[PDB]
Amino acid sequence: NYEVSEKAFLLTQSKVSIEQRKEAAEFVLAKIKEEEMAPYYKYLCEEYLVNNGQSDLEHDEKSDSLNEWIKFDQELYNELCKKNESKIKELNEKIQKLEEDDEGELEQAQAWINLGEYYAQIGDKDNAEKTLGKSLSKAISTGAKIDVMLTIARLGFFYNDQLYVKEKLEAVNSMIEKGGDWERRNRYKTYYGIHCLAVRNFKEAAKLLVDSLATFTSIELTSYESIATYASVTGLFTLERTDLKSKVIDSPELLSLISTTAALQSISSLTISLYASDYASYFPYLLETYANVLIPCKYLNRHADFFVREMRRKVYAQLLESYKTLSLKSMASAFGVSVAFLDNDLGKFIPNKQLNCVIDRVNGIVETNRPDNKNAQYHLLVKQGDGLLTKLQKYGAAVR
């Protein structure tokens, strides 16, 4: 389920390197017409029309792939249908006999679990959900919850939905029992990381995602590689350098991981960079990481220059605190950045309250002031008090 979703995302989000799109299109093509999934193939074809890299052939010319088939097609309706006939016919006879006899209360649930397979696979949302939800109402084993939990997940990646996926994720988790159980937790942990990186609080994501108790794969709820790279990468962006040397290069899981891959440039190169405190090293590496890991990813593409801007701020910041009367002519020349870049993105940082850098841009000199002061707390305390205040006027708008 995940490798299909992942390569459809990869496929559309391509504009560089031939073998990426080519190999993507082949796997999508092979799987999606074996599987009864028409509506995502459609979406794929909608989303990847009038793009570069086309593997669609209906009118195009913009193709750079060596596969000339990922268009929505009529062959689809012979492969899908003979399978759909077989599956509907088997399952119809099966549900009828099991439910008549009334043997057990656990054969009944196995009979409704078969329609949640069927239905997520064709891509119905609401039918899949309420067919399975029966099992939970006829809760008599915790199994019923495991089918509820698995189904929200499959559908989730396909659509790329945060909100009803969050809602259902919370409702099924919290429910009757709760438990430390392994793959309810693995699934809860990645998905919480997804959403909160999406809101842009970012710290909340970090609290669960960076931490992992899964040293091996969860297949279709995520690939081992995939979660692991994502945890290290959020690690870097949103946590301190005191945190980094604690936990994000000194957890024993990361150690078995850095063994064989260091192309993640964030389990190696950027972590080392951050520790060493450089900014002659850092910025080159970040761009290389952005291309190689963020833009292939389904989750970290959407956070673009924010991800860039805050990391360049964090590195400037750890330098700004360590020194005082600081020679901007010297920095701007030789810590690996251009002069023009350094001023204007430093100045871009300063009003937002992201640096207490005391600049003179062209006289070549920078000094430093403390990053917290009474004023800074007063300003943000005031921010939150009027946040609070507005919502009560809203309560007293509809009620009253």
Binding site: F283, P284, L287, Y290, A304, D305, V308, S333, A334, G336, V337, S338, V339, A340, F341
Partner: peptide, 19 residues
């Protein structure tokens, strides 16, 4: 944007060879 980071990359690379 996607474009900016590149423009900036190229500017940096040009400085760097003369650094």
């Amino acid at each position: 944007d996607d474009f900016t980071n590149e423009l900036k990359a190229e500017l940096d690379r040009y400085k760097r060879e003369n650094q």
